[PDB]
Amino acid sequence: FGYRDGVHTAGAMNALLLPSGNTFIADTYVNDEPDAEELAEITLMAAETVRRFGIEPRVALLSHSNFGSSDCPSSSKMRQALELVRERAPELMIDGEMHGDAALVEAIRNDRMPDSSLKGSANILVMPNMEAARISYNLLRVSSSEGVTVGPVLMGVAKPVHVLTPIASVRRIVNMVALAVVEAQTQPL
């Protein structure tokens, strides 16, 4: 198929149901160590996919650094990705980089950064590498006592296709068939 026009990367995104609501995690399956540009493109595609669900996207970039408390290369990569995203789509609600609890809890974020541009609890989480994304996704999947997901949604390819996992149940297959049909209804971009 190849990439859709205007994009040079692909990503995977998993849905999950936490006490704070529905939440998406990217990227979990494709890129082993994305750079800033790939992170920006993944963020934009994830925002569009979330918009499909009739939800107002809210993005958070996660790291062990908390608003510049560290200067390891990963945190710098997040800062560059954030500036790129703000350059491209100015109307998107996004902030970072921050800790996970700050992203999920309003009071913690407001204590440390009273004037953040992100309101409420984020519903899209972008990780620096596939290690963190996969580990967090699995641990949260088991610990959030439901154990149900909607993933992996694949974004970036020029045709409406998705790739599942061998442990996928019937309901997940039905959900992805419906989602692919919805994507294919409009003329592919």
Partner: protein, 190 residues
Amino acid sequence: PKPFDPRLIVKIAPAVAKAAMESGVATRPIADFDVYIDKLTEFVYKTNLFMKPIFSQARKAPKRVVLPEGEEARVLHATQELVTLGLAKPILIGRPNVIEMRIQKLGLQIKAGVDFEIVNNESDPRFKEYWTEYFQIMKRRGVTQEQAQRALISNPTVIGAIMVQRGEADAMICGTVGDYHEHFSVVKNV
């Protein structure tokens, strides 16, 4: 005066020269005494010949300079010599009691509030604005509000940099105690 006082030549020689001037025993009269005193000083201090344009330009319009390390003896001596030369308007940072006691101990003559200003770092009325501005600058570099307050209490260099940034001073001279790169990092960040 003690034998090794360096001001002896500068205070004596022009007076004797003027006494020669009045009594008519001189044979090679000097034009003006200012260049004479300058030459004597260049003999004394070995860098006046190099720094003379700087001193001449600076004496035309003094500015406000912050010395965060306002309890060192060297800084106090420098403040006295700066006031005497009429070359700047110093501002010191530290506890007023220690500064006054050491001024008495060293036998200087500069008087707090008349020749220079003392900023009490432990208790200042502008603490709120200072730490608020520091946080507004450094929030994305990993500085929480409590860290900002602690820094504005404990770090004189930060106080000096914030004072210069807001326009309450004009220059800062720091770093006579401690490592170079911590001061440089603070200055570059602010």
